[PDB]
Amino acid sequence: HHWGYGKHNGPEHWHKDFPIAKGERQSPVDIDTHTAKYDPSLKPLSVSYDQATSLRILNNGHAFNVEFDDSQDKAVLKGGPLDGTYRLIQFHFHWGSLDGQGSEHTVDKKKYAAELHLVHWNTKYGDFGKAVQQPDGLAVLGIFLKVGSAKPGLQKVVDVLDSIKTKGKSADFTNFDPRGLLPESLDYWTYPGSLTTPPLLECVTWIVLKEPISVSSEQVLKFRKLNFNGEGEPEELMVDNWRPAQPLKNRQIKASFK
Ligand SMILES: O=C(O)/C=C/c1ccc(Cl)cc1Cl
Ligand code: NA
Ligand SMILES: [Zn+2]
């Protein structure tokens, strides 16, 4: 498959190879704050990242992934809407060419400059490939980025991007603490959805944080210097690698906060 974000291979084309693109629980969605309902049954969200073990950062031609050792429970997400234990496997971002676009989820139709996805899988299914075949296989923690003050916890990521400029390049990325990417508040919205890239599988419990993090202009500018293309190929800047909001259909978005 040769999907991407251009006119000829972008989100409007994906359904031809991945018909679930037009399915009943696709992501992202617009979060209407005036219709999302507070759910008092939601348990506390538990982000347990103290023993996180990062390994590598990779430009995969769509975004860049920071990968983690998920062979044991070392960085997990629990609580909230979740039952059981979800292991952190990787995180990545989606971002824009302009500061007013880049996020996948929107809030009352507002776009943010970027969106962070921390991807976790349900350990009851044994490995990630099995988990993505289950309706409760994944939990993705989504965090909005707005342009303002620099995010110190993001700078080590920014610092290494020159070493993975093109598709297929990877670099060591051990001893990175993903706790430095979180906002102060863990207030969230949650709804059942999908992967936002092919194969678009409907296996995700989305947990989208209310509070955006701030990153600096220079930090997001360095995201935009990455390339979709491989080394030696014509340069295509890696920007606007986001899917737009999809129909909510038969779903309710719940809020953890009043
Ligand atoms: O978070 C995203 O934007 C896409 C994630 C993703 C895309 C493809 C596969 Cl096979 C698995 C995952 Cl977690
Ligand atoms: Na299992
Ligand atoms: Zn993503």
Q: How far apart are the first and last CA of the chain?
A: 44
Pairing of strands 45-48, 76-79: antiparallel
Q: Kindly give the distance from the C-alpha atom of residue 246 to the centroid of ligand 3, in angstroms, as a whole number.
A: 14
Is 62 one of the catalytic residues?
yes
Distance separating alpha carbons of residues 4 and 167, to the nearest angstrom: 13
> From the CB of 151, is ligand 1 less than 6 Å away?
no
Resolution in A: 1.4
Handedness of CA 186, 201, 71, 155 (dihedral sign): negative
Q: Are 101 and 87 in contact (CB under 8 A)?
A: no
Pairing of strands 114-122, 138-147: antiparallel
> From the CB of 119, is ligand 1 less than 6 Å away?
yes
Q: Kindly give the distance from the C-alpha atom of residue 19 to the centroid of ligand 2, in angstroms, as a whole number.
A: 28
Distance separating alpha carbons of residues 75 and 212, to the nearest angstrom: 22
Distance separating alpha carbons of residues 228 and 62, to the nearest angstrom: 6
34 is in an annotated binding site: no
Sketch out the chain's domains with CATH numbers: 1-258 (3.10.200.10)
* H-helix or E-strand spanning residue 220: helix 217-223
Q: In this structure, which residues have their CB less than 5 angstroms from ion ligand 2?
A: 126
Tokens (6 digits) for 74: 């070392």
Tokens (6 digits) for 199: 């194969």
Distance separating alpha carbons of residues 11 and 251, to the nearest angstrom: 21
Q: How many CB atoms are located within 10 Å of the residue 39 CB?
A: 15
3-class DSSP state of 60: coil
* Active-site entry in 15, 34, 62, 120: 62
Nearest residue to 179 (alpha-carbon basis) of 57, 29, 77, 56: 77
CB-based contacts of 3, cutoff 8 Å, min separation 6: 9, 10, 13, 14, 17, 18, 197, 198
Neighbouring C-alpha atoms within 13 Å toward the C-beta of 1: 14
Distance separating alpha carbons of residues 228 and 158, to the nearest angstrom: 17
Q: Which ligand 1 atom is nearest residue 94's CA? A: 3
Q: Are 179 and 213 in contact (CB under 8 A)?
A: no
Distance separating alpha carbons of residues 78 and 119, to the nearest angstrom: 13
197 is in an annotated binding site: yes
Distance separating alpha carbons of residues 105 and 98, to the nearest angstrom: 16
How far is Cα of residue 215 from the mean position of the Cα atoms in its chain?
A: 16
Nearest residue to 198 (alpha-carbon basis) of 24, 25, 20: 20
Distance separating alpha carbons of residues 131 and 18, to the nearest angstrom: 18
How far is Cα of residue 213 from the mean position of the Cα atoms in its chain?
A: 14
- Cis peptide before 135, with omega less than 30 degrees from 0? no
13 is in an annotated binding site: no
Q: Which ligand 1 atom is nearest residue 196's CA? A: 3
Q: Which ligand 1 atom is nearest residue 117's CA? A: 1
Atom 13 of ligand 1 has which residue's CA nearest to it? 119
Q: How many CB atoms are located within 10 Å of the residue 221 CB?
A: 11
Ramachandran bin of 74, using left for φ above 0, alpha for ψ from -120 to 50, beta for the remaining angles = alpha
Q: Kindly give the distance from the C-alpha atom of residue 94 to the centroid of ligand 3, in angstroms, as a whole number.
A: 6
DSSP secondary structure of 116-153: EEEEEEEGGGSSHHHHTTSTTSEEEEEEEEEESS--GG
8 is in an annotated binding site: no
Distance separating alpha carbons of residues 4 and 198, to the nearest angstrom: 9
* Structural biology method used: X-ray
Atom 3 of ligand 1 has which residue's CA nearest to it? 196
Distance separating alpha carbons of residues 101 and 192, to the nearest angstrom: 24
